[PDB]
């Protein structure tokens, strides 16, 4: 009498990653990198209306 | 006078035999053949997510 325990497979998933600009939400944001942002103190925007 | 009897027919039952690959059931399982499963003791599959 012979006996064996069989390991018959496994399946990983691809952890898919989205872009955030490959997405319809990103019309509402103007995302611009300001890479000195820590060194900023206070900023204003002008509006002549 | 003449007198007899007439066996006026006898008809058989045609048996249809299924094949199980020509079904919508086959989409649900993975038919794999493995001649040593009586020699198998336990079977394990581990998964990754």
Swiss-Prot record, chains A, B:
Domain of life of the source: Viruses
Q: Where in the cell is it found?
A: Virion; Host nucleus
Annotated membrane-spanning segments are none
Subunit annotation: Homomultimer. Makes the hexons and eleven out of twelve pentons. Interacts with triplex proteins 1/TRX1 and 2/TRX2; adjacent capsomers are linked together in groups of three by triplexes, heterotrimeric complexes composed of one molecule of TRX1 and two molecules of TRX2. Interacts with scaffold protein; this interaction allows efficient MCP transport to the host nucleus. Interacts with capsid vertex component 2/CVC2. Interacts with the small capsomere-interacting protein/SCP.
Q: Which family does it belong to?
A: Belongs to the herpesviridae major capsid protein family.
This chain's function reads:
Self-assembles to form an icosahedral capsid with a T=16 symmetry, about 200 nm in diameter, and consisting of 150 hexons and 12 pentons (total of 162 capsomers). Hexons form the edges and faces of the capsid and are each composed of six MCP molecules. In contrast, one penton is found at each of the 12 vertices. Eleven of the pentons are MCP pentamers, while the last vertex is occupied by the portal complex.
Q: What is this protein called?
A: Major capsid protein
Source species of the chain: Human herpesvirus 2 (strain HG52)
Q: Which gene encodes it?
A: MCP
